[PDB]
Design a protein around this ligand. Sequence first.
Ligand SMILES: N=C(N)NS(=O)(=O)c1ccc(N/C=C2\C(=O)Nc3ccccc32)cc1
Ligand code: NA
Length: 279
Amino acid sequence: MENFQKVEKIGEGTYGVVYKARNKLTGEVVALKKIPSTAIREISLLKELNHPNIVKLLDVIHTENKLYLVFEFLHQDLKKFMDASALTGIPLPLIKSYLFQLLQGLAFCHSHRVLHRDLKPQNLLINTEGAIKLADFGLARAFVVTLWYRAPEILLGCKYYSTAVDIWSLGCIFAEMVTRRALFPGDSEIDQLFRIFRTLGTPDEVVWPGVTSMPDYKPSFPKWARQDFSKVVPPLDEDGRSLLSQMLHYDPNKRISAKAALAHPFFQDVTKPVPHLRL
Ligand SMILES: N=C(N)NS(=O)(=O)c1ccc(N/C=C2\C(=O)Nc3ccccc32)cc1
Ligand code: NA
């Protein structure tokens, strides 16, 4: 750690405080996160998982029984950019570019059987060039927490969840970029589940075979009817609504993969605009 000078406290991440810091040996500006043998091996595997849409894990420092993770630094997260674009809205070509780039990042990680498990605007980082990158990828398997982007199978007690959990989270983020409001802002596990059910309908054996046998499923859940996506994400066009609907399928097996989402007609006219960033 003496090779790093703290510059700015970014904030309280999921596993520890993230700082902007300077490497005294290279002059490199990095993000430093201050966090068992199982964790060291899993974290070290993430150092190999390199993609332009994944925030690079530069180094793992284990000293005095403490763990420091050194990452590539980006200047802004999607939460700040969404708050800054609240009055105007993020232009649809930029939302589309960001969704496409994040689907590329997920297709890569998922092809290597690596899940994020905790996608949210706070871990999506952006730069002046128009890139967007997934931060803290794979740390959840390695080691108030927001529930807004949690997949229904996690909420219902699935212990062996799939890559589909990240597609759900990304679908929630996509809807939030479009509407300028969180899709399912639950403030408890049951409030989160019930907000999902009130929009998408209470799941049953017809739409999700095996749902009634899940650990936290209760036959006493209220039965709400599904709403149209035209009501959920206006004024998003039918290509965007159709893609979103597939990213929000209840059955994780029916839910679109990142690879298949990249081929969706919504991306026929994808471009890479440059955002209006004040740093
Ligand atoms: N400074 C605050 N609080 N918000 S901000 O939008 O300006 C902002 C600025 C920088 C960052 N950077 C965060 C990080 C970063 O650069 N690399 C990381 C790797 C893992 C986790 C977090 C990061 C995140 C947010
Ligand atoms: Na990396």
